[PDB]
Design an enzyme around this catalytic site. Structure first.
Site, mmCIF file in Angstrom:
data_model
loop_
_atom_site.group_PDB
_atom_site.id
_atom_site.type_symbol
_atom_site.label_atom_id
_atom_site.label_comp_id
_atom_site.label_asym_id
_atom_site.label_seq_id
_atom_site.Cartn_x
_atom_site.Cartn_y
_atom_site.Cartn_z
ATOM 1 C CB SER A 18 -14.725 -3.463 -12.284
ATOM 2 O OG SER A 18 -14.559 -2.382 -11.402
ATOM 3 C CD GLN B 297 -13.712 5.142 -7.909
ATOM 4 O OE1 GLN B 297 -12.997 4.367 -7.257
ATOM 5 N NE2 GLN B 297 -13.836 5.058 -9.219
ATOM 6 C CE1 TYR C 283 -18.591 -0.956 -10.165
ATOM 7 C CE2 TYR C 283 -19.328 -3.236 -9.784
ATOM 8 C CZ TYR C 283 -18.385 -2.343 -10.261
ATOM 9 O OH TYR C 283 -17.280 -2.826 -10.893
ATOM 10 C CG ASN D 223 -14.034 0.562 -7.041
ATOM 11 O OD1 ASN D 223 -14.445 -0.406 -7.680
ATOM 12 N ND2 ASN D 223 -13.541 1.664 -7.631
ATOM 13 C CB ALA E 220 -13.668 0.914 -17.058
ATOM 14 C CG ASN F 28 -13.472 3.625 -19.582
ATOM 15 O OD1 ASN F 28 -14.347 2.773 -19.794
ATOM 16 N ND2 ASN F 28 -13.566 4.543 -18.605
HETATM 17 B B1 LIG Z 1 -14.868 -0.984 -12.148
HETATM 18 O O1 LIG Z 1 -16.297 -0.949 -12.547
HETATM 19 O O2 LIG Z 1 -13.975 -0.840 -13.370
HETATM 20 C C1 LIG Z 1 -14.579 0.153 -11.131
HETATM 21 N N1 LIG Z 1 -14.861 1.492 -11.708
HETATM 22 C C2 LIG Z 1 -14.200 2.579 -11.237
HETATM 23 O O3 LIG Z 1 -13.340 2.468 -10.339
HETATM 24 C C3 LIG Z 1 -14.493 3.960 -11.830
HETATM 25 C C4 LIG Z 1 -13.784 4.183 -13.011
HETATM 26 C C5 LIG Z 1 -14.314 3.759 -14.199
HETATM 27 C C6 LIG Z 1 -13.444 4.057 -15.224
HETATM 28 C C7 LIG Z 1 -12.294 4.691 -14.759
HETATM 29 S S1 LIG Z 1 -12.245 4.944 -13.040
#
Ligand SMILES: *[B]([O])([O])[C][N]C(=O)[C]C1=[C][C]=[C]S1
Ligand SMILES: *[B]([O])([O])[C][N]C(=O)[C]C1=[C][C]=[C]S1
Lengths: 358, 358
Positions: B61, B117, B147, B149, B315, B340
């Site tokens: 992210s 997601q 929050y 994606n 992450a 992570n």
């Molecule tokens: B960003 O905050 O890194 C987006 N997070 C994700 O897509 C979820 C995940 C977090 C760790 C592995 S997939």
């Protein structure tokens, strides 16, 4: 100056001067970022004193563009936020109708109907607080735009409170000096009096009289050369050495509200370019410019748009001014005159000139 | 590096690596504008490849900060406006729940509950359209932050449409190239594979899997040197030559919404400095960071405040990254690891380091 500029300015401005019976006038055209100056008539009719490039004219409301930029500079410095309530910087303003009125509303005439003028009877600070404490809105905040000195005038006074400086000292040290506007004043000193043109109203020689929040709303006097530099600074802000001033000029041209094809900035007013001439010309008539009009918030504000016609009309009892520029074309014009002649005539002349050059 | 930086970094990171069982880690501290690098462990456990200043890590992210700045750059260019409706760039999104959802909402996770997601079944361009058409908001636009994606990822894809460029090409041409991030990639080229660290999850070597909107939301890989350069660029955007990029960086650090003591920018998140450490540390835990929270609109948005702790955690299944900087102190840190591990542990370490340096 190039023959093209001399030709369009001469054919456009001289008939204007004759049609409106303008005693004295100074014009600056910024072409490809370089200034070209023109002067005609008298600064003082009785003394047969000619208008020169050193002559000071009362900018009237074009002063609001300086207030807008100084406010933008204070925002960049972290001293104020347009999102803060007016009461944060004026704790004594406790009346219930002020809840929800922010510095943004004051700066953009959207507080809900603050009057065009602060009553002439308001003198002292006591008088001023009583006036605002007793004011009752015509509309809810952020719904209508009503052009007002009592609105942006207060924004300016509050914008500088955190710095602890007086409005005049903040303006001198944060705006006029960095930009080298060496002949621009809120209060004309004795040494410049000889260059301070007289304004003419119905044949009589006159100067703007003091009034509440005058410095903040309509109290700047400047020369055609300093005004040219002011246009160059707003046309190309990245060229400005001082970081917060560079950002303040950009914030003053952000589009906060829209009414029709017009956008309200801080002091400056903007339209997309190309612009329809009849729109800015007719729109400048006070029957329209001074009327309440509904506004649609631009959320969040659009950052300064290069392809814009950016402008401001200004007037005092005996002077009339106009400033307009198009950043994308590095083109601009300043028109200073010692007679308050109708706005549409100013814009028409300005459109003819800038449209010819690009 | 001066012994002071060396000591605080080693005294903080050594125990971190031991307690979190991190395979490899790279750290950069930007002090008074200069970068200092540190590395530990393995980029590839099986092949015994150490982490070096050239090792590529998945940013997860933290990639959203690049998307935020690219979007800001598009705004500065006049290609898009945060106030435009999402449908202006995706006319095919005709479902009524989209009325009133702007690009600002997408960029700042306030559209009304778009999911963290994008479902794994969503692959095709038509699969994506179907997904957004069928999505039902839990809340009205601009009232709650969740929050996601699927939210800033869509912002990124739409922000580049006017340019005609693919998202990767826009990113390379408008952000990576001007800033000299020559070892930062959305897709790692074969020539650079030897430097691509493996992520580790439950002991297994893993790399991020392809996914819809992956480039826009979490698909950038970079080295510790390029990330220190990214931090330096965000610390002093005024040093950047490319006008729209300097502006875009500043727009990404503006404060658009507030939740608790955190402000939402475009990708970046910000808190007033000095910060309460327990506030940014506990606040980074996903129990809070990924939770749905009401938001207060900052009307209009506050331009980038120099006195702020600006940061972003990131992450992937096998990587954990963190970036934080304080403009007013010309101080920053980047922590990239191929595991992570808990966000609070990252932020606590970063706090200890930067606080010790001023
Ligand atoms: B960003 O905050 O890194 C987006 N997070 C994700 O897509 C979820 C995940 C977090 C760790 C592995 S997939
Ligand atoms: B600004 O628009 O020049 C402020 N206008 C006024 O204060 C009204 C006028 C008063 C005297 C001449 S114009």
């Amino acid at each position: 100056a190039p023959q093209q500029i001399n030709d369009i300015v001469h054919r456009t401005i001289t008939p204007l001067i004759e049609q409106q019976k303008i005693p004295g006038m100074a014009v600056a055209v910024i072409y490809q970022g370089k200034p070209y100056y023109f002067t005609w008539g008298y600064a003082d009719i009785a003394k047969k004193q000619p208008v020169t490039q050193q002559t000071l004219f009362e900018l009237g409301s074009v002063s609001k563009t300086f207030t807008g930029v100084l406010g933008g500079d204070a925002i960049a410095r972290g001293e104020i936020k347009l999102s803060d309530p007016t009461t944060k910087y004026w704790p004594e303003l406790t009346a219930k109708q002020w809840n929800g009125i922010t510095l943004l509303h004051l700066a953009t005439y959207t507080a809900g109907g603050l009057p065009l003028q602060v009553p002439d009877e308001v003198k002292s600070s006591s008088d001023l607080l009583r006036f605002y404490q007793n004011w009752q809105p015509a509309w809810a905040p952020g719904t209508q735009r009503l052009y007002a000195n009592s609105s942006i005038g207060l924004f300016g006074a509050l914008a500088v409170k955190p710095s602890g400086l007086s409005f005049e000292q903040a303006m001198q040290t944060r705006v006029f000096q960095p930009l080298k506007l060496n002949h621009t004043w809120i209060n004309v000193p004795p040494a410049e009096e000889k260059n301070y043109a007289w304004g003419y109203r119905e044949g009589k020689a006159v100067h703007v009289s003091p009034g509440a929040l005058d410095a903040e709303a309509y109290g700047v006097k400047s020369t055609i050369e300093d005004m040219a530099r002011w246009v160059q600074s707003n046309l190309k802000p990245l060229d400005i050495n001082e970081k917060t001033l560079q950002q303040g000029i950009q914030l003053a041209q952000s589009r906060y509200w829209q009414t029709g094809d017009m956008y309200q900035g801080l002091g400056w007013e903007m339209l997309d370019w190309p612009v329809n001439p009849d729109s800015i010309i007719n729109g400048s008539d006070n029957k329209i410019a001074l009327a309440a009009r509904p506004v649609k918030a631009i959320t969040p504000p659009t950052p300064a748009v290069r392809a814009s016609w950016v402008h401001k009309t200004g007037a005092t009892g005996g002077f009339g001014s106009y400033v307009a520029f198009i950043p994308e074309k590095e083109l601009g014009i300043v028109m200073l005159a010692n007679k308050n002649y109708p706005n549409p005539a100013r814009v028409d002349a300005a459109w003819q000139i800038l449209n010819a050059l690009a």
